[PDB]
Amino acid sequence: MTKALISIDYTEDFVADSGKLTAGAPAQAISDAISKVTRLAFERGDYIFFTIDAHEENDCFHPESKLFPPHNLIGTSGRNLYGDLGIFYQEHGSDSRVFWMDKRHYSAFSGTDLDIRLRERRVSTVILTGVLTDICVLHTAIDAYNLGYDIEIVKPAVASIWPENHQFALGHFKNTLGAKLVDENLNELF
Amino acid sequence: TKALISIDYTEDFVADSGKLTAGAPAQAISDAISKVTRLAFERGDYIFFTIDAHEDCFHPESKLFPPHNLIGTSGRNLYGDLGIFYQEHGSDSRVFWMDKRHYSAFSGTDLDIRLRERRVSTVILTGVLTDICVLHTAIDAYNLGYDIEIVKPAVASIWPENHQFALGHFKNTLGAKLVDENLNELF
Amino acid sequence: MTKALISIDYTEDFVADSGKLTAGAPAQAISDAISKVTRLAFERGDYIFFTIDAHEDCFHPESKLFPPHNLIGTSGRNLYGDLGIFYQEHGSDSRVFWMDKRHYSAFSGTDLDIRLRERRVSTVILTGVLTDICVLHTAIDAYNLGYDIEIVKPAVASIWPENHQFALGHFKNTLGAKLVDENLNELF
Amino acid sequence: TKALISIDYTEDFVADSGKLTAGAPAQAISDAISKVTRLAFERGDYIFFTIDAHEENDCFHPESKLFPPHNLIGTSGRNLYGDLGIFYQEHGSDSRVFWMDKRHYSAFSGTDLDIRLRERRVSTVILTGVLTDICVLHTAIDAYNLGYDIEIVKPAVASIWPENHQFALGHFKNTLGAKLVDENLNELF
Numbered sequence A: 001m002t003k004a005l006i007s008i009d010y011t012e013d014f015v016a017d018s019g020k021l022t023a024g025a026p027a028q029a030i031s032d033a034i035s036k037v038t039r040l041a042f043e044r045g046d047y048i049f050f051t052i053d054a055h056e057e058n059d060c061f062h063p064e065s066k067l068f069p070p071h072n073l074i075g076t077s078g079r080n081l082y083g084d085l086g087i088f089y090q091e092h093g094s095d096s097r098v099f100w101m102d103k104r105h106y107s108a109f110s111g112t113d114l115d116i117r118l119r120e121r122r123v124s125t126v127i128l129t130g131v132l133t134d135i136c137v138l139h140t141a142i143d144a145y146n147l148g149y150d151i152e153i154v155k156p157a158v159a160s161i162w163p164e165n166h167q168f169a170l171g172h173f174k175n176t177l178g179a180k181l182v183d184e185n186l187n188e189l190f
Numbered sequence B: 001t002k003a004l005i006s007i008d009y010t011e012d013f014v015a016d017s018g019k020l021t022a023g024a025p026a027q028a029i030s031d032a033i034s035k036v037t038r039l040a041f042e043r044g045d046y047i048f049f050t051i052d053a054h055e056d057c058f059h060p061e062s063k064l065f066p067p068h069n070l071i072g073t074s075g076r077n078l079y080g081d082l083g084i085f086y087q088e089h090g091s092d093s094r095v096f097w098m099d100k101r102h103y104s105a106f107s108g109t110d111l112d113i114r115l116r117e118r119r120v121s122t123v124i125l126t127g128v129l130t131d132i133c134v135l136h137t138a139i140d141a142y143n144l145g146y147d148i149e150i151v152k153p154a155v156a157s158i159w160p161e162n163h164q165f166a167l168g169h170f171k172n173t174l175g176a177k178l179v180d181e182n183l184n185e186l187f
Numbered sequence C: 001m002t003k004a005l006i007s008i009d010y011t012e013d014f015v016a017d018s019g020k021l022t023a024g025a026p027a028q029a030i031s032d033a034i035s036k037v038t039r040l041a042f043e044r045g046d047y048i049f050f051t052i053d054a055h056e057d058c059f060h061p062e063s064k065l066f067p068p069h070n071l072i073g074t075s076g077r078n079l080y081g082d083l084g085i086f087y088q089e090h091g092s093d094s095r096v097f098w099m100d101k102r103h104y105s106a107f108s109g110t111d112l113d114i115r116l117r118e119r120r121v122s123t124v125i126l127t128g129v130l131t132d133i134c135v136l137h138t139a140i141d142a143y144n145l146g147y148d149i150e151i152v153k154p155a156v157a158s159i160w161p162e163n164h165q166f167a168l169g170h171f172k173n174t175l176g177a178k179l180v181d182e183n184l185n186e187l188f
Numbered sequence D: 001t002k003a004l005i006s007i008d009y010t011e012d013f014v015a016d017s018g019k020l021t022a023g024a025p026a027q028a029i030s031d032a033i034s035k036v037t038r039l040a041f042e043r044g045d046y047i048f049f050t051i052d053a054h055e056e057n058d059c060f061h062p063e064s065k066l067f068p069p070h071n072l073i074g075t076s077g078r079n080l081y082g083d084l085g086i087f088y089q090e091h092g093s094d095s096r097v098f099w100m101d102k103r104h105y106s107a108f109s110g111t112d113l114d115i116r117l118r119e120r121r122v123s124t125v126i127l128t129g130v131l132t133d134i135c136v137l138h139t140a141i142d143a144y145n146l147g148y149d150i151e152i153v154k155p156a157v158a159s160i161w162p163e164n165h166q167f168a169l170g171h172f173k174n175t176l177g178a179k180l181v182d183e184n185l186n187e188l189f
Ligand SMILES: [Zn+2]
Pocket: A053, A055, A064, A071
C-alpha cells in the first residue's frame, strides 16, 4: 500500500505567463487539482517527490540546450513551484516524507536516485502529476514502467501545451503502460 | 560506424494474419525497411534485430495485448526481405539477434553493453510500432546519450496520428535526425 | 516470505578437474551444500535463477583476461554435480530460470532485476563461484538495487582462501549481508 | 580526454579525528592524490569529486546500521582533505571540475556520473581516493560494467586494512583489466 506521488516540473518557468518555457493556460488550469491531490496524497501518508529541472547556462554538452531556450536555471525564480503547490512545499518540505530532486533529463529517474529512494521504502506504485504530459511526465512514466512500478496518472493534474499531445500521452499511459487514470480525489476514472 | 536497430518487424506484427498485426501500414514499409538495412550493412554498420520474445502472468503486458511473438512460433520470424537478409547474414559478426520482453530494445537486454563495446555513438531506428517499441527505444537511447536517427519510411504505426506524434517527438524533444531509406537527411 | 536464490556459474568449466577455468578442489567441495540449499529453497517456494556465463569475441574485455570458458553450446556450461539433477527434475518449472550472462555480475545486461521486480522479491540468496568475482559483482549490484542479501557460506567458493575470506567479510561488513548455512539458517 | 574521479577524500575518511577515518594510510596518499589531480587538470581532463552525502537518522539507508555517522551534509566531515581541498577552492568553479553528492559506495549509483561522461564521450576513467576496497572498488566495478577503460592511481588510493588494499589492486588488474598508474599517470609494471 506504499505509494509515492511524483510532482514533475510544476514551476514558474513552465506554468506562469512570464515563464521561459511556459505551457501557459493549460498548465495554469491544473493549479487547483495538482495542489489538492498532492495535499491529499501527503494526508494519506504517501511519499512526495518534487522532481524539478535544474539547468545551467551555456551547458554545451547537454543535447537539450539546442532544443529549447534556457529554462529552470539553477538559482533563478524560474525554478520556484507554481501556486499552492509552492505553499505546500514551504510548509512540509522539511518532513521526512517530502523530497526535492534536481534532474537534467526529462524523466525523473534519469541520473537521479529516485529509483533508489523508492526501493528503500518498498514503494510499488508511483502517482504522476505535472508538466508536460507528453515530455517529462511521459518519460517518467516509461522509466517507471520499465522499472516495474505500478502507475497512476492524475488526469486533471497533468497538462501539455498541445491538446493532441496530451491526448496521445493519456492513451499511451492507459493502453500501453497499463496505468490507472485517477482524479484529484485519487479515485479511478472510467 | 553506426548501429541500425531493427525493431519487431515480424510476421505477428506485419502479416495479415499476425496475432498483433499493424496491417497495411506495417506492410507498406517492407521495401524501405529491407533496403535501408542492407544499405547500413553494406557500409559496415552493426545490425541489431531486437525482437519480442513472449510466453507469463508476471508480465504486465499480458493484460494489455493478446499473445504475440511466442517463442518457437513462426510469428517471431522476420517479415519479407528482412527475413531473407537475416537468413543470408545473421551469422556475420556485425549482425545480432536480441530477445526482448519490454517494448524498449534496451530494457533487460545487453544492447547498451554491445554498443559501448564497439564505441557506437549513433543508433539508427527502424521497425514497429513508431509510438510504442520505437518510441520507448528512442527515449532509452536518448537517456543513454546516443545520437539518434529515425528512418521515417521504415517505421510504422497502426494509427497515423500516433505515427505523427512519435515523429514529432523524435525531432523536437529527442533531437533525432529524420532520414530516408538511403540514409539521407529529410528536410 | 518468498525470496530468490541465485545460482552463479556452478558449471563443469568452473568446477570439474578438466574445466577450462576450473577452481578445482574448493569448488568441488561445495557440491553437496550447493545442491542441498537449492533444493531447499525450491521446496520452500523460492524462485531459482541459474545465471551462467555464455561466452563466444574480440570486443569483450574479459577475453584478454581469462582463457576460453563456458563457451555457448559446449559441455563446459553443464551444471556440476547433483545441481544438474535438480535442473533435470525442475528446469521447466515456472519458478526456475536459466539466464545467460556475459559479465561477472548476474545483473549486467540481463533481465534479472526485471524478473525479480515482477515477483516483488526483496531478498536474494547467493550461491556459486567464484566468491570474489561473479558472486561479489552480483552482490554489489544487488546492494545498489536495494535487495536484502543472503550469502550461503558453505555454497560459495574461490580459488584462493584469502580472496574467499575478503569477499565474505565484504558481504557482511559493507553490504550488510546475512551469512547462512546450507539449511538457510543464519550463522553466528 | 579522460575523467579523473576523486572518491571520498574528505575529513571524515582521512583526518585523525575523522568520524570514519582510515587514518595513517589515507593521510599518506595526500601528496600523491593532490599531485595527480592537479596533473590531470593540467592535461585537460575532467575532474569529478564524488563525495558521500549522508543525513542524520536516515533509517531507510541500509548503510546507517553498518557504519557510525559520517560525511553528514552541512558538516566539516565533508571537507576535502589536504591540498585537494585547496585545489577545489582554486578550481572548483571551473567548467571541467564537478562536485557530485553520492549516497551509495559507488560513484555511479543514483548519480548522473555516467550521463556526464557520455555527454563528453569519455572512454577512460582514472580512479583515486578511499577506500580502495569499498567506494573505489564499487566505482571500478560499475565503470567496468558500463564499458569504461579504467586506470587506477596506485599511490593515490588507500584502505585502512593493507590486505584489503592488496585484494582490490589485484582485482582491478586481473579481473577488471585496469591499468595501474603512478602519480605521473605513467603505467606501472
Ligand atoms: Zn528542461
